[PDB]
Amino acid sequence: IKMKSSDFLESAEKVSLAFHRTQGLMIMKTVYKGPNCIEHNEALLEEAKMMNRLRHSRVVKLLGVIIEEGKYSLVMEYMEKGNLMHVLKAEMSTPLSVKGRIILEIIEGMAYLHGKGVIHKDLKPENILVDNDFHIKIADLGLASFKMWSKLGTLYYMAPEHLNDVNAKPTEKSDVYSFAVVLWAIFANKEPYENAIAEQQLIMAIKSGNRPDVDDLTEYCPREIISLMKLCWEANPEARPTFPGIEEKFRPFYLSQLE
Amino acid sequence: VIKMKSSDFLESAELDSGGFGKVSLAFHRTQGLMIMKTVYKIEHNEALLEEAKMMNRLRHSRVVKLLGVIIEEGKYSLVMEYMEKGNLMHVLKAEMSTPLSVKGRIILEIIEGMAYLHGKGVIHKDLKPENILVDNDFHIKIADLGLASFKMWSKLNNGTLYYMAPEHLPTEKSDVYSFAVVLWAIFANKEPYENAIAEQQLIMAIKSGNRPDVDDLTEYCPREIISLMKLCWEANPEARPTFPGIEEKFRPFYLSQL
Ligand SMILES: O=[N+]([O-])c1ccc2[nH]c(Cc3ccccc3)nc2c1
Ligand SMILES: O=[N+]([O-])c1ccc2[nH]c(Cc3ccccc3)nc2c1
Numbered sequence: 001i002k003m004k005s006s007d008f009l010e011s012a013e014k015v016s017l018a019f020h021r022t023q024g025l026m027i028m029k030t031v032y033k034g035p036n037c038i039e040h041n042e043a044l045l046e047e048a049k050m051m052n053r054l055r056h057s058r059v060v061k062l063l064g065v066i067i068e069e070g071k072y073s074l075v076m077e078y079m080e081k082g083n084l085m086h087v088l089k090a091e092m093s094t095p096l097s098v099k100g101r102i103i104l105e106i107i108e109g110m111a112y113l114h115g116k117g118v119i120h121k122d123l124k125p126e127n128i129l130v131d132n133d134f135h136i137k138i139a140d141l142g143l144a145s146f147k148m149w150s151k152l153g154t155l156y157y158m159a160p161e162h163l164n165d166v167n168a169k170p171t172e173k174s175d176v177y178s179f180a181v182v183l184w185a186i187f188a189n190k191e192p193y194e195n196a197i198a199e200q201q202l203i204m205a206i207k208s209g210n211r212p213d214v215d216d217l218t219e220y221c222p223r224e225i226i227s228l229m230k231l232c233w234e235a236n237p238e239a240r241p242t243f244p245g246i247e248e249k250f251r252p253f254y255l256s257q258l259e
Numbered sequence: 260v261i262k263m264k265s266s267d268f269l270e271s272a273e274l275d276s277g278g279f280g281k282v283s284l285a286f287h288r289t290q291g292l293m294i295m296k297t298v299y300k301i302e303h304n305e306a307l308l309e310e311a312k313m314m315n316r317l318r319h320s321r322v323v324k325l326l327g328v329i330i331e332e333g334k335y336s337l338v339m340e341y342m343e344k345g346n347l348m349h350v351l352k353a354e355m356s357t358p359l360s361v362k363g364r365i366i367l368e369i370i371e372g373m374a375y376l377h378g379k380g381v382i383h384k385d386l387k388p389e390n391i392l393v394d395n396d397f398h399i400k401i402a403d404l405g406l407a408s409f410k411m412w413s414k415l416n417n418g419t420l421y422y423m424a425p426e427h428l429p430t431e432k433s434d435v436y437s438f439a440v441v442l443w444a445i446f447a448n449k450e451p452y453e454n455a456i457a458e459q460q461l462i463m464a465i466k467s468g469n470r471p472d473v474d475d476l477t478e479y480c481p482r483e484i485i486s487l488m489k490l491c492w493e494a495n496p497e498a499r500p501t502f503p504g505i506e507e508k509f510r511p512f513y514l515s516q517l
Contacts, residue, residue, distance in 0.1 A: 035273035121456045144456055151277060154457045166455035166464045167472040203463055 001052055003064040005071055018075060025078045026063055031143075032072035032152040041067055043148045048074070051146060054116060058109030060129060060139040072152060076139070080132040084182075085125035087134070088189045096222075098134045099186055100258035103225075106182065107250055109138040110175065111243040118145060119170045123178035124157045125185050155199070156192050157181045160207050160235055173237040176246075180232030184212045187221040209235050224253055261315050263327035263338055271295055278345035280389055280404035285338070292341040293326060296404065298416050299335045306411045307335065314409065317379060321372035323392065323402040335415055339402070343395055348388035350397075351448045359481070362445050363517040365391075365399050366484075369441065370509055372401040373434065374502040382429050384408040386437035387422040388444050420461060421451050425494060428462050432496040435505075439491030443471045446480035468494060483512060 009019040011028060018028035032038065048065045055061065066073040081087050084102070087094065106128065113120055120127075121144040129137050143150045159177035161168055184192055192212035196202040211233050214226060228250070234240050271285040274294075285295040311328045318324065329336040344350050347365070351357060369391060376383060383390075385407035392400050405419075406412040420428070424436035440451055451471035455461040470492055473485060487509070493499050 037273040037275045039275045039278060153459070155459060158457070158460060162456070163460065164464045164467050164469060166452050166461055166469055169454055170456075199459070200463060 001048065001062070001064050003066050003073075003075055005066055005068060005073075017078070027076055027078050028073050029076065029141075030071060030073045031149055034070060036069045038072065038152070040148065044072070044152075047146050047148050054113070054118065056109060056112045058105050058137060059112060060137045074149070077137075079129035079137060081130040081134070083126050084128035084130055084136070085185065085191070087130050088125070088186065093189070094134070096220075097258050100254045102128075102130075102134065102136050103183065103186065104247075104250060104254045105136045106138065106179065107243055107247050109136070110179065111247055113138070114172050114243055119172060120175045120178075121145065121170050122154055122157070123175045123182065124154065125182060125191075128182070155203065156212075159237070160209075161237055163203055163207050171237065172242060173240045176232050176240045176243065177234075177237075179243075179246075180229045181212065183225060183229040183232070184214075184217060187217050187225070188212070222257070224257075261311070261325070261327050263329050265329055265331065265334065265336075268293075268295070274345075276389075278349040280346060280402070282404060284341070290326075293338050294341050295329075295336055295338050296406075297334065297336040298406070298412060300333055303411055303415070304330065307415065310409045310411050311337065317376070317381065319372060319375040321368045321398075321400055322375060323400045337406075337412075342392040342400065344393040346389045347391040347393060347399065348444065348450065350393045351388070351445065357448075359479075360517050361397055363513045364397070366442065366445065367506075367509060367513045368399045369401065369438065370502055370506045372399070373438065374506050376401065377431055377502055381408060382431060383434040383437070384429050385419050385422070386434045386441065387418060388441060388450070389418060391441070420458070424496065425466050426496060428466060430496065431501065432499045435491050435499045435502065436496075438502075438505075439488045440471060442484060442488040442491070443473070443476060446476050446484070447471070481517070483516075 007021050008028060009021070011017045011019065014028075014030040014033070016028045016030070018026045020026055038044075045065070045067065048062065052062045060079075061077050063075045063077055065075065110120065110123070120138070120140065122140065122142055123138075127139045127141055129139055131137075140146070155163070157178040159174045162170070162174060181192060193202055196205075211230075214230075217226065228246070232240055232246075267288050268285045269288060271283045273283050274280075276282075279294070281296070283295045283297060285293050287293050308328070308330065311325065314325045323339050323342075325337060325339055327338040329338070373383065373386070383401070383403060385403060385405055386401070390402050390404055392402050394400070403409070406416060407419075422437040422440050424433045427433060443451060452461060455464070477485070487505070491499055491505075
């Protein structure tokens with residue numbers, strides 16, 4: 001699964017557009033560039049391997065890597081429209097049925113990740129990438145699951161239990177909460193909590209049970225989805241449903257009500 | 260008297276900061292291996308030079324010795340002695356079964372070192388496992404490889420969040436907090452707050468009383484050291500003891516128990 005730096009051409013923009021020589025268009029995240037010094041290549045390759053095993057239509061695929069002297073890159077597949085929040089904020093308003101697919105696809109991808117024991121610690125619209133006809137893939141662009149590559153805002157989507165208790169081990173129910181807030185954002189066409197003055201006031205407000213304003217959302221969003229996000233953003237973790245539990249009810253709903 | 264030229268060295272080669280800090284390994288024409296920290300490539304020449312002399316005057320077996328300074332043209336660098344095993348955390352991860360008596364040794368020596376530094380009016384503004392260097396026989400020396408505690412050398416240059424005191428997220432109790440987490444780190448064999456996902460999350464968390472998980476630790480670490488780290492990471496900086504206060508209780512405890 002290895003690659004070379006000579007294989008790619010220039011690139012715009014370090015996240016950059018990597019025109020491969022033969023295979024064509026991809027995106028290159030150069031994680032390190034400099035002296036050479038990096039001693040622990042072995043762990044980097046095994047965790048590239050460990051995240052190469054994640055194979056799904058609804059998850060971003062590691063195309064390859066570059067491990068050479070003064071450069072370290074993760075090569076992933078190009079997604080034409082960018083991230084989800086960019087799509088929503090784009091001047092055309094997306095219809096209900098497309099938003100339905102997006103949501104079902106997010107559920108599919110997460111269920112797969114949770115199937116493989118990978119809890120996403122940072123699920124948010126910036127990690128949901130979109131292709132030309134609105135099909136999505138889930139990424140981890142901050143490398144929160146890849147210890148070693150990291151060794152080379154978000155808070156709106158963080159579950160109460162993790163706020164002011166960093167030793168709490170993330171569970172499946174941590175990103176179900178983040179899913180809830182993604183749902184809001186999908187029908188709100190913007191980031192949540194825009195009226196807050198203090199960030200510390202917000203964090204304590206969120207701990208004590210405050211959530212994004214649904215009053216803004218009732219016009220454009222069906223009731224079954226509004227109930228879903230409230231279930232998912234419960235203060236109690238056990239109160240929240242699993243992704244398979246969401247899938248089982250949301251798939252028949254999407255198919256029969258949204259197309 | 261302590262000045263060195265670039266041409267005194269044959270070659271230099273960068274080191275991994277995970278193991279050795281932000282440093283290069285150089286070879287002195289007549290003196291062999293040294294580690295060189297190039298900080299920059301007239302302004303504040305006089306202050307920088309005297310600060311180097313301030314750290315040249317730090318002479319203690321458990322503290323890093325400055326060996327020279329390069330100040331020339333567009334290059335300012337510091338030179339220090341070579342420590343082969345690298346920093347503490349690098350050794351703790353590679354050396355699996357580091358026994359209780361050796362970890363006691365290292366803790367006593369960190370305490371010796373810090374009390375000396377404070378005795379010279381030097382407050383470590385960034386104590387952490389990556390600033391604790393290890394020689395071949397597992398003895399330690401305290402360093403400030405970021406040069407946080409030297410006003411002018413840090414500016415020239417212009418990890419830590421885990422060890423910084425909550426009030427600062429510098430008095431004689433600031434680095435007592437850092438030391439507390441070093442104690443945890445020593446018996447945990449790893450950096451703290453592994454589950455923390457965001458910077459700002461971690462800053463508010465620690466600020467409201469969150470601390471490293473002792474449950475990933477209880478069995479390897481003696482109960483007096485658990486009391487010591489709990490005291491040293493109190494939210495209130497007056498509740499924390501001093502390094503001489505710590506040295507007096509820990510020295511005999513090392514001798515009789517470990
Ligand atoms: O360079 N990158 O930024 C990058 C590269 C490959 C990726 N593969 C995924 C999918 C994924 C994996 C693990 C948990 C959740 C999602 N994200 C990636 C991000
Ligand atoms: O090349 N360097 O970067 C370097 C050189 C000499 C040093 N001497 C100390 C000792 C010290 C100072 C202040 C607080 C604690 C310990 N650190 C050094 C770092």
